[PDB]
Amino acid sequence: GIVMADWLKIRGTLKSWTKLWCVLKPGVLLIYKTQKNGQWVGTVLLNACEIIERPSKKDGFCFKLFHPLEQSIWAVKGPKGEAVGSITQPLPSSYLIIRATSESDGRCWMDALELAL
């Protein structure tokens, strides 16, 4: 039931950006290390999120996914029941900052995200 799938650049508290494979389908953003034989990193539950644009210095196009009550946006278990996620740079409990490599790509993602919410 995939709606969009692409590499996206993701950051947390740290200034560092990590390029990860994200699959958008109804209700969830699924994050993997690779498109192919991906190790599951985490799943964002869109039901718990709001989305806002986040204009910035390293931009491409930049937006923010967050829990309005600053609670967890993350699914407890993997799409295949995976107990624990693959190691990445530490990501925030209650938000993701996201930029697509191209601004036009970023805009489609953001617009797409609003629907899947």
Author numbering: 8 to 124
Task: Show me the paper's own sentences about this structure.
The oxysterol-binding protein (OSBP) and its related proteins (ORP, for OSBP-related protein) have emerged as central regulators of sterol/lipid transport at the junctions formed by ER with other organelles. ORP5 and ORP8 possess the structural features of a lipid transporter: an ER anchor (TMD), a membrane targeting pleckstrin homology (PH) domain and a lipid-binding module (ORD, for OSBP-related domain). Indeed, ORP5 and ORP8, and their yeast counterparts Osh6p and Osh7p, have recently been reported to mediate the counter transport of PtdIns(4)P/phosphatidylserine (PtdSer) between the ER and plasma membrane (PM): ORP5/8 was shown to transfer PtdSer from the ER to PM, coupled with backward transport of PtdIns(4)P from PM to the ER, resulting in its hydrolysis by the phosphatase Sac114–16. Critical to the transport function of ORP5 and ORP8 is their recruitment to the ER–PM MCSs.
To understand the structural principles of ER–PM tethering by ORP5/8, the structure of the ORP8 PH domain was determined by X-ray crystallography. A distinctive feature that stands out, however, is the presence of an unusually long 25 amino acid stretch forming an extended β6–β7 loop (His209–Ser236). Comparative analysis of electrostatic surface of ORP8 PH domain with Osh3p PH domain reveals a distinct positively charged cavity, representing a putative PtdInsP-binding region. The analogous surface on the Osh3p PH domain has a neutral charge suggesting that ORP5 and ORP8 PH domains may possess a distinct PtdInsP-binding mechanism. Close inspection of the distinct positively charged cavity of ORP8 PH domain shows the amino acids forming the basic patch are lined on the β1–β2 and β5–β6 loops (non-canonical mode). Structure-based sequence alignments of related PH domain containing LTPs ORP5, ORP8, OSBP, Cert, and Osh3p establish that the putative PtdInsP residues (red inverted triangles) in ORP5 and ORP8 PH domain are not conserved in OSBP, Cert, and Osh3p. Notably the side chains (green triangles) mediating canonical PtdIns(4)P interaction with OSBP, Cert, and Osh3p are missing in ORP5 and ORP8. To confirm the importance of the non-canonical basic surface for PtdInsP binding, we designed point mutations R136Q, R179Q, and R158Q, R201Q in the ORP5 and ORP8 PH domains, respectively. Both the point mutations in ORP5 and ORP8 PH domains completely abolished the binding to PtdInsPs, confirming that ORP5 and ORP8 PH domain follows a non-canonical PtdInsP-binding regime. While most PH domains (including Osh3, OSBP) utilize the canonical PtdInsP-binding regime for PM targeting, the PH domain of ORP5/8 possesses an atypical PtdInsP-binding site that does not permit PtdIns(4)P binding.
